[PDB]
Each structure stands twice: as structure tokens, then as C-alpha cells.
Amino acid sequence: NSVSYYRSASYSHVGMVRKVNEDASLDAPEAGLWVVADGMGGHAAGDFVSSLIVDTLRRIPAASSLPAYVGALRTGLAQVNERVRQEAGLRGVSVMGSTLVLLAARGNQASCLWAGDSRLYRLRGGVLEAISRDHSYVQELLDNHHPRANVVTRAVGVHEQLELSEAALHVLPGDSFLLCSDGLNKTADDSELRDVLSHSDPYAVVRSLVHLGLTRGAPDNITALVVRAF
């Protein structure tokens, strides 16, 4: 019952309103690493931060021990946070940051690190389950389609100390995972995500998710990254 192999695919689209894609992704199954980052601040700001995230995380050496790897990912994100803070302060801009959601896998164990309203879902036995929980003003109100949905309470470059949320996962053969920016779940509810994810091919699945989003007016940059365990 141990997990042998991870298949993955990613697809992003600027959408139907924005003309600059500030979404970024890293599809590195060769390092057991999958990342989606939703940049904010417009061109030369949001995409700057999201691309810096994916490039910094890509260069981290793939340590065999998942907990050590996760420690290294955390440190890399802290360094990205500090660099973005320095740059934003220098330019004097109000908005310069990016959400993050990553999944790192080693055999039968995986870890999710996230900050923002980019999500990780797990599909197991045809049942979809939200692993991450939005760092959003709305989510805090719900924990106690809302107009306060544009307020992200944690993301890279927002605060001095970046506080990442973490969730550990036991992976079974046949498990599926979806990393996405809010542009997808904003245009398809969780039951439709479960429907589209219930297919064998991650490449067709991510393209079908983005297509459904585009079909419903794609108000935001829409990115989907699907991982399947064997």
C-alpha cells in the first residue's frame, strides 16, 4: 500500500478581465514539490513576488527527509518575505506580495505549507476535502461571495514575520491533490471541482478546470496544478 510515483501537471490563464497574469506555479515532481502563488500589486509587483517565490523554492536542494525539506522550504519563504519587504519599502508602493500554497511529498508522507487564499484540496475515494483554510478576513468571520473577500490576512510580503500554516498528510495510492489560486474556486464550487478532478489524467484535468473557469467569465488569473499518487 506504499506510494510509488507522483504524476503532476499545471496550467494557468490570465482570465477574461485581467491582462497581466500575476499567478505563478512550480511543477517539480523531480523534487517532490508543487507550488501555486497568487501575486498581488499589478505588473512588476505581484508577478515579481510570485516568480521570486517559485524560483527561490525551485533552487532548494531536494533533501530525502521530508521534515528537513519542509524546514528548508520555510526558511526559503522567510528569505523571500524579507527581500519583498525591503523592495516594497524602497519603491514606496502600497501593494507588493503573493499568496503561497505548496505540497511537498516523500513516499507515503506529504506536507502542505500555505499563506493566503490559494488552496490545496485532496480527492480520495471520489470525495473532495479542503486541506488548506484561507487566510482571509471572510474566513475569520465564517470561523466565528462576501464583499471582504479581497482582504488576505497572511501572504508573502504582507507582514514583517511571515507565519505559514502547515498540514501533514498521509498519502495513499490513488490520492489526488489540487493546488489552485482563488480564480478557480471563484468560478467553480467544490462539487464541480470534485467532478473535474475525478479523471485519470492530471494534464486534461487542469486544462478542464481552467476551461470551466474561462467558460464562466474568468474574472481573476486562474491557475490549477493537479498531483496524482500511484
Shortest Cβ 98–Mn ion spacing (Å): 7
38 neighbors 21 (Cβ within 8 angstroms): no
Q: Which span sits near Mn ion by CB under 5 A: 14-22, 28-36, 78-86, 157-165?
A: 14-22
CA count, 13 A, side-chain hemisphere, 108: 4
Q: How far is the CB of 99 from Mn ion (least distance, A)?
A: 7
Residue 113 to residue 160: CA distance in whole angstroms: 18
How many whole angstroms separate alpha carbon 130 and alpha carbon 206?
A: 17
Mutual angle of helices 202-215 and 190-197, in 10-degree steps: 140
**Interface characters, 26-45, with Mn ion (x: CB under 5 A):** ------------x-x-----
Sequence-distant (6+) residues with CB within 8 A of 92 are none
Enumerate the known binding-site residues for Mn(2+): 38-39, 182, 220
- Axis-axis angle for helices 46-59, 66-91 (nearest 10): 150
Q: What is the smallest separation between the CB atom of 124 and Mn ion, expressed in angstroms?
A: 26
Interface with Mn ion (CB under 5 A), residue total 6
- What length is written for the chain? 230
Nearer to Mn ion among residue 59 and residue 145 (C-beta): 145
Please state the closest distance from residue 83 (CB atom) to Mn ion, in A. 19
Distance CA 30, CA 6 (A): 9
Which of 136-144, 162-170, 201-209, 212-220 is the region at the interface with Mn ion (rule: CB under 5 A)? 212-220
Instruction: Show contacts with Mn ion in window 139-198 (CB under 5 A).
Output: 181-182
- The answer to the question of residue 22 lying near Mn ion (CB under 5 A) is yes
Question: Given phi > 0 = left and psi -120 to 50 = alpha, else beta, which region is 59?
Answer: alpha
x/- binding map, residues 68-97, to Mn ion, per CB under 5 A?
A: ------------------------------
Among 106, 220, 222, 229, binds Mn ion (CB under 5 A): 220
Residues at the site binding Mn ion, with contacts judged by CB under 5 A: 22, 38, 40, 181-182, 220
